[PDB]
Design a protein around this ligand. Structure first.
Ligand SMILES: [Mg+2]
Ligand SMILES: [Mg+2]
Ligand SMILES: [Mg+2]
Ligand SMILES: [Mg+2]
Ligand SMILES: [Mg+2]
Ligand SMILES: [Mg+2]
Ligand SMILES: [Mg+2]
Ligand SMILES: [Mg+2]
Ligand SMILES: [Mg+2]
Ligand SMILES: [Mg+2]
Ligand SMILES: [Mg+2]
Ligand SMILES: [Mg+2]
Ligand SMILES: [Mg+2]
Ligand SMILES: [Mg+2]
Ligand SMILES: [Mg+2]
Ligand SMILES: [Mg+2]
Ligand SMILES: [Mg+2]
Ligand SMILES: [Mg+2]
Ligand SMILES: [Mg+2]
Lengths: 183, 131, 256
RNA sequence: GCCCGUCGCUACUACCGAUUGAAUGGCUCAGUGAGGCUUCCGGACUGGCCCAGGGAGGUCGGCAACGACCACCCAGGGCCGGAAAGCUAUCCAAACUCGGUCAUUUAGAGGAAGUAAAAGUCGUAACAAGGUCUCCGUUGGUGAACCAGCGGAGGGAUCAUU
RNA sequence: AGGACUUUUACCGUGAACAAAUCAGAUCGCUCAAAGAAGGCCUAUGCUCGAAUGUACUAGCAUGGAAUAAUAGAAUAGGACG
RNA sequence: UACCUGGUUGAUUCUGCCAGUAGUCAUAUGCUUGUCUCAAAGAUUAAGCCAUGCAUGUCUAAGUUUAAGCAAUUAAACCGCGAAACUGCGAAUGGCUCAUUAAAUCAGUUAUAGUUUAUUUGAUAGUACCUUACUACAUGGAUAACCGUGGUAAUUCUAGAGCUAAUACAUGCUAAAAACCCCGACUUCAGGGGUGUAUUUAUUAGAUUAAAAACCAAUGCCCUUCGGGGCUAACUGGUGAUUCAUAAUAACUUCUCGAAUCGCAUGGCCUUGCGCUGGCGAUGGUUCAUUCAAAUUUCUGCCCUAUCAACUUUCGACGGCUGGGUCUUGGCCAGCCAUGGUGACAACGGGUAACGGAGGGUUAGGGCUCGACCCCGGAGAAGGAGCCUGAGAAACGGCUACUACA
RNA sequence: UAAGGGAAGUCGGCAAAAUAGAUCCGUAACUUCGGGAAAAGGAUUGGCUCUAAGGGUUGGACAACCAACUUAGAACUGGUACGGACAGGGGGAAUCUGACUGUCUAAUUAAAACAUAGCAU
């Protein structure tokens, strides 16, 4: 595999000629189709002596609820959408910008113990009571996700590069956009 | 429509400080009003995108706009030839990305600035439109 | 395979080294450090091709690692250590200090400093940023990193760094009226006064330099080196950075 | 005086030419496809821990069976690892076969030209009004130069007839 | 040093930058020369000049010049001016 | 040093070529060849084939010594020299050739705000984080060298068996104290947990364009001669230009680094304990900068040919988007969408007895021609392809496979 | 139906075998420019689960109720098999001859013979 532009036709339509044997730095490597399963992380040596971690069947990931800066390590359940290819959804392939299902248990535990309000020692409650009044009720779109137990999340990392599946929860019009795609 | 595609668009790290992002490319070019007040999305626009402008600043005449967000520039120039003391009418065709901020037709004169390789051919971004 | 070169050709060696063309096929190659290689000066050339102590490769190699040559007060056993601008070379065995300053011809000369000029150096500020822990730091032209500079040193300033602790004694701001030395281009080794500064956005700004003979010149701030605010902070070589034409140079010889 | 062409002898050059001609190289469709990277299993071989136990001395309590304390050496189960051969599926792809195309050389019976060499045969077409003025385009004919028809030119043998 | 108002190209002047070696060219009695970058001075003690200078067409960068050669401008005024 | 001469004719003036003339750092060949200095030299064609020999190894006080090695050493406790072997480094430099190659290489000029970097140089890391039976006055298991038994005709082939070291491989405790976020029993206000760096994700700060009066929605605070005033402060880097430099919060990891290494000098103190401390170095280590660089990259510029006029696009051709891959950008690749891109200013195709250039020869000016070759760049190692180690190779005096040769 | 060979059999490849449908690609000399041409020569084809496109009617880039075929794309799957039986061109380079389509010796000769258009008298 190589990434050189010598094998391509010119912009005018001309066909380039053979110049040199394949170079080591213009490679070029086999893609890793990360999916859902028991963890397999392979490591590959790179040009600077650095190391790249290939993700093969990742199961758990670190996800961010940005509306209040709460991030928890949850379980990736199933890929629901992918703008690139529909076949990546069917085989449950994990790549960047993929809409997935994740467990809502760690986020519900934090929300209940921080605001003291349902989602489906006198100093403590007023500490929680003041927090709820300042913030307000969660968006209904995020509400219906919670009682079903699974949250929409977009993966923002590169599992084939860093070996980690990280992302953030859908919320706002971005959530509404992907819900239209899923129906 | 802005969200006329298969993925949400776009601005990467502008979480919904809370306002639409833009910058100035420097070198005396003024950011178009469309970029400031527009809802369009383009990751290769010199103002609303991540792309920086550095290198050579050229100009020419717009020839074709049948593309999507890229135009072709004709750069007429005269080539001097010793042994004859005359010139030749030569020309080159240049590919440059055009941001949705400008309304450009064929025959207009534009100024482009060098950026990183955006595609197989494009290495320049439209900065100003004269007419 | 492919990798960095390790040899150097005598013909392709820098001109200012003034190397014999028929001595051999190869020339000394600087390793790394106080560069750029264009221009710098190897230690072997300084001790063999300028002092002859040190007549050939073997004797200079013996001298280097007998631990007798102190570059900026630091022991260097590198036979081809890239001695550069403003660097101070010390030989305690004979008891004198040398400094590398360009002359009018554009070549390094054997300049001598007696006792106190070897206690410091002038360096050109190349970089100011925030360090690993929000700690401002400063980089000079000789790769020296200073972890705590004065806040008023912005860019291109010349700092007097002490040669046994690295601390800054004083700095000179880059502005018109300062004594400047041209360290590059066609005007190598020319000392004058900054007069005009025109700004061209694009990274090729021009500096106008006036000589002691009321001669106007132009150079980029990549070759302008500030020496003094009102008077030079170091000792200039013979000629005081004033270039004479071919005629006046000949006349000086005929008179002398 | 000069001069043209067929024919005949000698030498040389190139051209056409049956031979599905031949050779070399580049690119390329299809088929088979070594080797290797990645990957799915696989796990010989080899480590660690846990579970209660086998052999062999010193004493005490009980009506026998038995149980308790102090110090050595060895059989059987469970779990967690590393890992070679091999193996699954992609990918890179040498190589060969089979066609296609391009480029360059090269053989060929025979045919039709050119050039050169001179004391060869036959005519005398052109140079004078060259003895039918010469030449051009086209067509037909003839051993050969050439001839003839139609139209044109003067580079004509007329710068002119009242 | 921040901003506004500059018709745009060709052309000419100037400036910066623009490997060595080669070429032109300065100096020195390698016994002259081709060459080389040496050498010379003091008896010595060690003292010193040199190893120059020019050359960057065309393309690129900065500024000035405004003749010459091109192109636009107010005409269904959709023109300029506070 | 801006130059001519002979030759068509009986003679003339021309057109026009032939010949003569001179230079070549331009090759061969013939004859001849006393001396000094300097010196090219299997490119042309066969990048055709190669016997043989050599061309890449390397040790300091400062990695590992029980040689049944030497030399002087002590019964012992191990070093002065020092082999073998393990470990580290280099072997990707240099040298050779010009086969391929025509916007390709290359040259001048740009960019990396789109990247990697062994080595050199300067700085640079305090963290109660959590695992072993535990320890830090110091953890664990192997393997050479060596002893002995072989195999095959044969290789710089190696097996079985007994040891034994690490700067080879693998583990592993840490530094006080400050400050910050979270959890918090406790009538209206103790205690515990986390906070180095390295990685990934998410979020916040990283300012500054001319001034004044109103219901506040929210505590308005302080100063209250209980009118009224000030006020939620002071400071705040860089680039022409960034989501920059940098800081902070919530988490994450097949959890990187944070020294179980070596030499010299051996000195100080008091609770005299084989107690506490003390420099110079060697090697090594994270981040940042720097160095040698590498890699792409902008503009402009290449000989002949139309008996090459249309070329690219099924299966990437021009572009947009998402992702993957890469050190990184990119139709580099995978998916979806649109129909574009080049050309008479010569595209596309073909030829080169074409590597590009700095430059060589010869010229009044303008030019013609050559450039394999002492320097810079590129490519190759019988012809293609693939790959390991490694900072650096698609390496060939490395490996694997196929073809030819041997 | 036959191992290995593949016309060596024979006056002679007579007889038999081989090719064969559909889709996609590719297609020469020659030429009366209409052809040659199905030239030559290649690849795919099953089952199952899906996806998409191609319409009509009534109410105002929409909504609801109907419709039966054709094409394209993708996973999975199998002793790599799939026009699975049936059905179903062998091809190429030339020479002689007649231009071609057509016709005749019912019951041994279907041909180069006859005819034909065209030409001429
Ligand atoms: Mg190579
Ligand atoms: Mg160096
Ligand atoms: Mg006549
Ligand atoms: Mg006449
Ligand atoms: Mg002339
Ligand atoms: Mg004549
Ligand atoms: Mg005569
Ligand atoms: Mg001649
Ligand atoms: Mg080399
Ligand atoms: Mg550092
Ligand atoms: Mg695209
Ligand atoms: Mg992309
Ligand atoms: Mg060649
Ligand atoms: Mg050659
Ligand atoms: Mg290899
Ligand atoms: Mg027979
Ligand atoms: Mg019959
Ligand atoms: Mg019959
Ligand atoms: Mg008939």
């Amino acid at each position: 595999i190589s990434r050189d532009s010598r094998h391509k036709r010119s912009h005018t339509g001309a066909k380039r000629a053979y110049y040199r044997k394949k170079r080591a730095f213009e490679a070029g490597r086999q893609p890793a189709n990360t999916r859902i399963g028991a963890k397999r992380i392979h490591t590959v040596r790179t040009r600077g002596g650095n190391h790249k971690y290939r993700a093969l069947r990742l199961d758990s990931g670190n996800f961010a609820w940005a509306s209040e800066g709460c991030t928890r390590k949850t379980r990736v359940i199933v890929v629901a959408y992918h703008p690139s290819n529909n076949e990546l959804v069917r085989t449950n392939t994990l790549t960047k910008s993929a809409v997935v299902q994740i467990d809502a248990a760690p986020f519900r535990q934090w929300y209940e113990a921080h605001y003291g309000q349902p989602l489906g020692s006198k100093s403590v409650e007023k500490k929680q009571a003041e927090r709820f009044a300042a913030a307000g009720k969660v968006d209904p779109a995020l509400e219906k996700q919670f009682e079903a137990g699974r949250l929409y999340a977009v993966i923002s990392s590169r599992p084939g590069q860093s070996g980690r599946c990280d992302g953030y929860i859908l919320e706002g019009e971005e959530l509404a956009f992907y819900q239209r795609k899923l129906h | 429509t802005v969200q006329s595609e298969r993925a949400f668009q776009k601005q990467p790290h502008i979480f919904l400080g809370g306002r639409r992002w833009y910058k100035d490319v420097g070198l005396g070019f003024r950011t178009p009003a469309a970029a400031i007040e527009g809802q369009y999305i383009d990751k290769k626009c010199p103002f609303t995108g991540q792309v920086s402008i550095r290198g050579r600043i050229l100009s020419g005449t717009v020839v074709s706009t049948k593309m999507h967000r890229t135009i072709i520039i004709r750069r007429e120039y005269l080539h001097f030839i010793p042994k004859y003391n005359r010139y030749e009418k030569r020309h080159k065709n240049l590919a440059a990305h055009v941001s949705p901020a400008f309304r450009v037709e064929e025959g207009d004169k534009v100024t482009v600035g060098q950026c990183r390789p955006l595609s197989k051919t494009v290495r320049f971004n439209v900065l100003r439109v004269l007419p | 395979g492919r990798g960095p070169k390790k040899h150097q050709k005598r013909l392709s060696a820098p001109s200012h080294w003034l190397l014999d063309k028929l001595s051999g096929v190869y020339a000394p190659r600087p390793s790394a450090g106080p560069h750029k290689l264009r221009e710098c000066m190897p230690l072997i050339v300084f001790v063999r091709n300028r002092l002859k102590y040190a007549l050939n490769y073997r004797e200079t190699k013996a001298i280097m690692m007998q631990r007798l040559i102190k570059v900026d007060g630091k022991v260097r056993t590198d036979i081809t250590y890239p001695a550069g601008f403003m660097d101070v070379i010390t030989i305690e065995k004979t008891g004198e200090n040398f400094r590398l300053i360009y002359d009018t011809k554009g070549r390094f000369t054997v300049h001598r400093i007696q006792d106190e000029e070897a206690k410091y150096k002038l360096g050109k500020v190349k970089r100011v940023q925030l360090g690993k822990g929000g700690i401002p730091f400063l980089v000079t032209h000789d790769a020296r990193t200073i972890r705590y500079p004065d806040p008023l040193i912005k860019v291109n300033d010349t700092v007097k760094i002490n040669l046994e602790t690295g601390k800054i004694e004083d700095f000179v701001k880059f502005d018109t009226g300062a004594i400047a030395m041209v360290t590059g281009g066609r005007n190598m080794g020319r000392v004058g006064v900054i007069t005009h500064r025109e700004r061209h956005d694009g990274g090729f700004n021009i500096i106008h330099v006036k000589d002691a003979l009321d001669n106007t010149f132009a150079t980029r701030e990549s070759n302008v080196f500030v020496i003094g605010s009102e008077k030079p902070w170091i000792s200039l070589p013979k000629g005081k950075g004033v270039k004479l034409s071919i005629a006046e140079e000949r006349d000086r010889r005929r008179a002398n």
